[PDB]
Amino acid sequence: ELQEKLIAVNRVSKTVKGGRIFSFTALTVVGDGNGRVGFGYGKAREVPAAIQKAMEKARRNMINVALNNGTLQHPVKGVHTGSRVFMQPASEGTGIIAGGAMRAVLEVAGVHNVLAKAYGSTNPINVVRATIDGLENMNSPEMVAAKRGK
RNA sequence: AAUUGAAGAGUUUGAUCAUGGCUCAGAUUGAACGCUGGCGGCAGGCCUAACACAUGCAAGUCGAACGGUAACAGGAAGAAG
């Protein structure tokens, strides 16, 4: 019931004294399938150590999302660095139809059938960060009615 | 009951993030070309030279408008084997 999946692995470099030194970065997202989404970055010298650090950071640093029946509630826009992201609840608008690196976080998030369209930059490290910010500041009808009295 | 509706990716760098262009994945067509080709249904078929046109048809009808008889088939009368 952990439901982990990796989005992006890259080879970064460092350029020391004698030549270059190549390191690998993972970027994974875990989530239970009912709210509870996390992402982790993690970087290491080989690929399986990178993904393992990424999973291990992603299992902690996990955020609650106030889902609807199987989906979002109201249309929400989350931004991070250069990466602007729209989402629309699509009240059984079948299938998760999101961009790459947004399909994954929305998939393990437990949502099933939203409509997305990322704008701006679509770097995978910043398009999540713009989905969680997004799903984090999406509030439910029992939270809005809690705030404003009824 | 009559709008249930939205996906990205590759490429600037030793690597990064951003900006930014180029390019790809889709659908479409009065299409052409290449390879191949069994049947049917429904549609479509000179986008260019509003260039030049052989030949055949594409606008005739009415005698219940009229003088009339060129034919065709009868009618009447005459003459002949």
Q: What number of other Cβ atoms are within 10 A of residue A148's Cβ?
A: 7
**CB of A28 within 8 A of CB of A59?**
no
**C-alpha dist (Å) from residue A118 to A25, A97, A121, A122, A149:** 23, 11, 8, 7, 35
Length of chain A: 150
Which residues are paired to A4 by β-bridges? A30
Distance CA A122, CA A7 (A): 13
Distance CA A114, CA A8 (A): 22
**A149 CA from B62 C1′ (Å):** 94
Q: Which of A28, A30, A46 is nearest to A38 (CA)?
A: A30
**A95 CA from B37 C1′ (Å):** 40
Task: Write down the H helix ranges in A11-140.
Answer: 47-59, 103-108, 124-127, 132-135
Asked whether strand B has any atom less than 7 Å from the CB of A81, the reply is yes
A131: left (phi over 0), alpha (psi -120 to 50) or beta: alpha
Which residues are paired to A44 by β-bridges? A24
Distance CA A89, CA A70 (A): 10
* Experiment type: cryo-EM
Paired tokens of A46: 């080989």
Asked whether strand B has any atom less than 7 Å from the CB of A43, the reply is no
A83: nearest nucleotide, CA–C1' criterion: B18
**CB of A96 within 8 A of CB of A113?**
yes
Distance CA A79, CA A111 (A): 19
**A117 CA from B44 C1′ (Å):** 39
- One-letter amino acid identity for A85? V
